[PDB]
Design an enzyme around this catalytic site. Sequence first.
Site: not given
Length: 436
Positions: A75, A119, A287
């Site tokens: 990832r 991100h 997460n």
Amino acid sequence: VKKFPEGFLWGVATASYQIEGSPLADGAGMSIWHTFSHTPGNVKNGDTGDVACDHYNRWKEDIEIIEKLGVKAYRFSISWPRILPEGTGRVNQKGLDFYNRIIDTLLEKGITPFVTIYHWDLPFALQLKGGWANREIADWFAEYSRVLFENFGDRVKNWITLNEPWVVAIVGHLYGVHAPGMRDIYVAFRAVHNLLRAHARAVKVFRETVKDGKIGIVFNNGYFEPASEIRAVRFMHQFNNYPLFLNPIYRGDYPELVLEFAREYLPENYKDDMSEIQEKIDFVGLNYYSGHLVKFDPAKVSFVERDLPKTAMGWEIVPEGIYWILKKVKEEYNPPEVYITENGAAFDDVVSEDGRVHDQNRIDYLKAHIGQAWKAIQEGVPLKGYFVWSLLDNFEWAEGYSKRFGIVYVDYSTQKRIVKDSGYWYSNVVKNNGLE
Ligand SMILES: COC(=O)Cc1c[n+]2c([nH]1)[C@H](O)[C@@H](O)[C@H](O)[C@H]2CO
């Protein structure tokens, strides 16, 4: 023994700004983390992403490390301003080239790419136009996503629109601790709402452009327990965990206690966007890192410090949290697939005189959490994969290089990678497809 299903995806996870360095190489535009980290006082020790792990040059080496560890999925995120230097309009072929080489290499080596589209490294050019505060970001994000789909969608089949939109909005625009460093609660919730609309626009484009892949979205989650014998725990879950975003996605409105607290901060006609926001997604990424004891306190919630082991972040180690959040997501929204897209720990790693990094604390942390995720699978949670944060020690945002989360140690003076005991241990977990 605790074996996982056949085809379970063992992964490691990184993010562009945290590992790459060279933020301005090959025509890349500035990102908001470039400008934020270059502003004095924002990041510990004046640290920036200028060099980081120099992954921009060392990418092949790092991938060879993933390969040699036998890790099955990688990832990683794409830097929006490498691809579109002004955020919209011009496409930078050298930016595309960089990720094309990483993608092809992974595929050649039998590693499955999981691409995080965003991100946190927003093009600075778009922050000038309001960033996440501006409704037009739904279009900017959709055009960026379309570029990624067209260029990489032949090879990448697993996509994540947003990493932790709660952090992006709240930590970036209310707490001011992350880029763009703002403190305005009305901006923060307009960012929340706009992140949803941008995510849903990108999913929609994905269905038009990449007809054989899967797309989802990643949320941060804490395991909140009450200090006594509680609605405060309900609020924290609904606000800090996946419900802030999943209630809109699945049920078409914000969670109840989120509205009680924040209705005045959301746009007046925000329900007008909810049907679009319900665009079907293929998976939920969760997460998980930490548990928190919580009490009402006249956001009307504060944390209570507990004994309990903590990491170098001061995060209480609570492995049953990952089981809880896995069970709870199925119970609340029943998504067809779930991944743990990040789990890991920061410890004060030291290279021993033997040349090795003896991070038994990290092994214990991972083992405990992997075991708790195993349990959730036995009880029916459609968990398809698990990703260690992180492959490498990297730039830990406002903490700079002072916090080490890697299963691979990075000596920043030389850029030498040293596989930690936890990395070797994890390799054996992946080879065995589980614990023993
Ligand atoms: C409030 O919930 C959280 O912030 C959980 C969280 C941890 N982490 C992340 N989110 C980011 O995705 C990574 O970029 C960080 O490096 C990693 C470790 O701090």
